[PDB]
Design a protein around this nucleic acid. Structure first.
Ligand SMILES: [Mg+2]
Ligand SMILES: [Mg+2]
Ligand SMILES: [Mg+2]
Ligand SMILES: [Mg+2]
Ligand SMILES: [Mg+2]
Ligand SMILES: [Mg+2]
Ligand SMILES: [Mg+2]
Ligand SMILES: [Mg+2]
Ligand SMILES: [Mg+2]
Ligand SMILES: [Mg+2]
Ligand SMILES: [Mg+2]
Ligand SMILES: [Mg+2]
Ligand SMILES: [Mg+2]
Ligand SMILES: [Mg+2]
Ligand SMILES: [Mg+2]
Ligand SMILES: [Mg+2]
Ligand SMILES: [Mg+2]
Ligand SMILES: [Mg+2]
Ligand SMILES: [Mg+2]
Ligand SMILES: [Mg+2]
Ligand SMILES: [Mg+2]
Ligand SMILES: [Mg+2]
Ligand SMILES: [Mg+2]
Ligand SMILES: [Mg+2]
Ligand SMILES: [Mg+2]
Ligand SMILES: [Mg+2]
Lengths: 117, 94, 136, 76, 58
RNA sequence: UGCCUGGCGGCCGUAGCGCGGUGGUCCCACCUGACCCCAUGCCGAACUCAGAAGUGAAACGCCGUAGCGCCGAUGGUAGUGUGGGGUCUCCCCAUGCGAGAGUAGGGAACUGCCAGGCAU
RNA sequence: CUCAACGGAUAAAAGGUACUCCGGGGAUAACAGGCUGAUACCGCCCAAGAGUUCAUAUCGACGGCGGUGUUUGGCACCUC
RNA sequence: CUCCUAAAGAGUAACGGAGGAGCACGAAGGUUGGCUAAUCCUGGUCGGACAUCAGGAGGUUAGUGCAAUGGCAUAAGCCA
RNA sequence: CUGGUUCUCCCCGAAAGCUAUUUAGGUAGCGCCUCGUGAAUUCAUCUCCGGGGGUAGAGCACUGUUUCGGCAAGGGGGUCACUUACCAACCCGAUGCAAACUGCGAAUACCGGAGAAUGUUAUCACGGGAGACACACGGCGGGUGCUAACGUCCGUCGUGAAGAGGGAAACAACCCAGACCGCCAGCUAAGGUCCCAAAGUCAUGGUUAAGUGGGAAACGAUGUGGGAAGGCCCAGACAGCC
């Protein structure tokens, strides 16, 4: 029983609900070394904005690329990248991860940066 | 060596096939290879005598249709449910 | 007398007996008794025809019974009016369609198998015929 | 022992077939389980009655990895 | 355009309800009645439905 | 532009399973540590955090392979609407529709968005 | 409110009649007819076996196919 | 009330074929978070065909307060 | 509840179902009839398009059931831990069966949309007046019964009911066909054409010898017609005779 397939099972219900609501969701993927963030169109097939720690434009200004304060950088970056693009209200898709620690630090940072969710 | 004379069918379907069997004939089909399948008619009692021999289902038979020989092998046979008759034969190109 | 050891239900609808049969060729032995008629085969008729064939070949070779009486038949007793529920199960039958192979035999010469099948056919209510195993 | 009992028929089944134009709130299908599943603009009642949440034409589709039948409203 | 003539050859007594409706759709009123109709696949479909009791004259 | 990886989809087995091979710069996975955030109806297994010594064993991805699954004609057969007929518990004829199973065969998915790496 | 006779005649109700009576019904029974033929009766088919030997002189199991309308019935079509 | 009869929309009778109900629950309801069976095999104190433990197979053959049917993995099943 | 209900013509024209009922031969609402008024291209048929099926059929992965083979746990009876009249799970291969089985799945029917043609609005709504709620047979699909009944109970269509005429000898329900009236005209349908009795003692090619036709099964048989093969045979077959 891989931890991944058990995690997609945890994320399926919320994603179906967001798909039914027709909302533009902020997807978050978390690895032991990196953290990722995507804003998907309501149709679920277009990536509007994206930000992560594998981008050197953000990675160079971090001590370690996979700790809690690194997630706050991606949260701040993905929000201001989306605000100027025109998206203001989204829905946070924790995607099977517990809303705690790094993904929580990513969320409130994006919430602090002016993304309404 | 078995050689069979056949004619190409003009029309298919339940109504046509039953008229054949009333006229002492029965339909058949030739498929296999890259060519298109070929629907043919066969004289029943003449073919019925040949299939009574065990080598009919093992050797390679030749069917002359429009004066053209085709080497095939008997693939499947549809017999009458309770009469000593044939209803259909599948021929696969050798 | 053949009979299901147990059933999901005790009584069944009368139904109909249309169509042709499945299992129209000798599959186990070399000779078979194929039914050309339509009707029912009670469990007693099946047993009677089996004994006639079993004794005909003096208990030699192998005999298969390709049918099985799985349909229960109910009857109302005498001096009973219509209604008051379905009758009680009295015997079991197997529905037979034309072409059904009833018995198969192996291990005996053909001339002996014909006489064995002829003796058994006299016990059955449907017209039958002799068939032999063929190369499919 | 004795039979002779039955219950009243419940009039289940599809009420609006594919392509039919419906108003918001129209019942599409009554069912015991979710033989049909709610798609877009279609709600699922407490008895799994599928009703239109918007006007438009009803649409039957089979989707998902389990090949389940969905009913949606093409809003028009 | 291309018209055809249809004649009713048998009676409508005892026919199916939709067969009587097809004769009424063609305008045939009695045995031997002949009408003129436009040769259309919709008309051809009506004739085919009651072909056992009508005769078409093309 | 090509190769490769990750994320989100379309599609829902021609897409699955097995068998064989193969991949670690990056990515991913395992991994290291755990006082603390947090966690175990016991357990840092899981969840979570802090990390980067090691390893591609597992897992995952990729490549091959017809062992199985899966897909699948043509023809025939069963059934059947309408009309007619018979020896009428069942059939037949005209006409329209026409399976299921099986056979030949197919088949080791396809594809969109974004991102990163690498070659270019 | 087991008003459960569950759209619930009253808050409150069991029987006998061969001493019977009225209005009706062949819408519905008993006799007889009819239809039917499970049953009954009669015949036939197969032939295990009995008959010292020998199936078929005489019987005939296990089963099968009919006839009659003839018993017990089924139905309720005629006559209340 | 559930299934069949019921003739692939609905409905559809018989003293037709089978079963149930006249409740239960302040959690067995709401929500958030998590979780995934049956059976069997192997190994293992008492310990046995069957207890708890570990692993593999298996893939819902389990489960659902109760009949049947339709559902149920995003679980409608299990835990906080 | 039974009986009876008195002049004429014209138009339309049922029902014997559902639901409820101390209700079942009564009655009520609805369905069906009539009259009036109003209203939409409203309705019907066909073609095309969009649908949902789970029936017929089929199938056997599932639920059950069933036969054979293989592999074999195990149950066996046998010896006292050996080999042993027998039964045998699971699995594998092969073969069937199912109203209450489905990994399949029609024809039809039904719902919706569009389009012509045709139909005296044939459709819906409201209002006045009803009748009817004992149905019958025939076809098809079934339950029940004995795939018994001119039986019984549903579905659906037709006819009778409430429909005359022609045919089936006679024969409500079958076949043909829907009678406004008159004609000493014609053409046809089912069914018929030797006589009763209107029309072919018609034509061509066959079959039957049983008055079969003009009532019936298992089964029996050198009846006879047609067809396709086969064995044997002038190295003399088959029958007869030595
Ligand atoms: Mg046909
Ligand atoms: Mg870890
Ligand atoms: Mg197919
Ligand atoms: Mg009452
Ligand atoms: Mg009542
Ligand atoms: Mg009352
Ligand atoms: Mg009196
Ligand atoms: Mg009477
Ligand atoms: Mg009497
Ligand atoms: Mg009388
Ligand atoms: Mg009397
Ligand atoms: Mg239905
Ligand atoms: Mg009138
Ligand atoms: Mg009125
Ligand atoms: Mg069937
Ligand atoms: Mg099965
Ligand atoms: Mg009444
Ligand atoms: Mg009545
Ligand atoms: Mg009736
Ligand atoms: Mg009657
Ligand atoms: Mg007369
Ligand atoms: Mg008139
Ligand atoms: Mg004339
Ligand atoms: Mg004359
Ligand atoms: Mg002459
Ligand atoms: Mg005679």
């Amino acid at each position: 029983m891989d931890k991944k397939s058990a995690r997609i099972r945890r994320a399926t219900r919320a994603r179906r609900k967001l798909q039914e609501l027709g909302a533009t969701r902020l997807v978050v993927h978390r690895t032991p070394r990196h953290i990722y963030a995507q804003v998907i169109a309501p149709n679920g097939s277009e990536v509007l904005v994206a930000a992560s720690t594998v981008e050197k434009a953000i990675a160079e200004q971090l001590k370690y690329t996979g700790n809690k304060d690194a997630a706050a950088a991606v949260g701040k970056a993905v929000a201001e990248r989306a605000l100027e693009k025109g998206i203001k209200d989204v829905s946070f898709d924790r995607s099977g991860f517990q809303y705690h620690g790094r993904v929580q630090a990513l969320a409130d940072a994006a919430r602090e940066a002016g993304l309404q969710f | 060596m078995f050689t069979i004379n056949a004619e190409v069918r003009k029309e298919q379907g339940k109504g046509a096939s039953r008229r054949l069997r009333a006229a002492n004939k029965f339909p058949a089909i030739i498929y296999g290879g890259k060519e298109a399948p070929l629907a043919i008619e066969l004289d029943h009692d003449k073919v019925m005598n040949m299939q009574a021999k065990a080598e009919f289902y093992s050797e390679v038979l030749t069917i002359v249709v429009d004066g053209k020989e085709i080497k095939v092998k008997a693939q499947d046979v549809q017999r009458h449910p309770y009469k000593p008759k044939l209803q259909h034969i599948d021929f696969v190109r050798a | 007398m053949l009979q299901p050891k147990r059933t999901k239900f005790r009584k069944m609808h009368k139904g109909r007996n249309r169509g042709l049969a499945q299992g129209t060729d000798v599959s186990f032995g070399s000779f078979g008794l194929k039914a050309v008629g339509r009707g029912r085969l009670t469990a007693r008729q099946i047993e009677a025809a089996r004994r006639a064939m079993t004794r005909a070949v003096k208990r030699q070779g192998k005999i298969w019974i390709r049918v099985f009486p799985d349909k229960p038949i109910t009857e109302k007793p005498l001096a009973v009016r219509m209604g008051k529920g379905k009758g009680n199960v009295e015997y079991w039958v197997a529905l037979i369609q034309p072409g059904k192979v009833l018995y198969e035999m192996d291990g005996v010469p053909e001339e002996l198998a014909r006489e064995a099948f002829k003796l058994a056919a006299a016990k059955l209510p449907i017209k039958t015929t002799f068939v032999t195993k063929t190369v499919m | 022992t004795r039979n002779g009992r039955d219950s009243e028929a419940k009039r289940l089944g599809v009420k609006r077939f594919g392509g039919e134009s419906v108003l918001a709130g129209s019942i599409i299908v009554r069912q015991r389980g979710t033989k049909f599943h709610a798609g877009a603009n279609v709600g699922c009642g407490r008895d799994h009655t599928l009703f239109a949440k918007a006007d438009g034409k009803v649409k039957f589709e089979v989707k998902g990895p389990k090949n389940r039948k969905f009913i949606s409203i093409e809003a028009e | 355009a291309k018209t055809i003539k249809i004649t009713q050859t048998r009676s409508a007594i005892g026919r199916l309800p939709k067969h009587k409706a097809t004769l009424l759709g063609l305008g045939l009123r009695r045995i031997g009645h002949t009408v003129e109709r436009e040769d259309t696949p919709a008309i051809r479909g009506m004739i085919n439905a009651v072909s056992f009791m009508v005769k078409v004259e093309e």
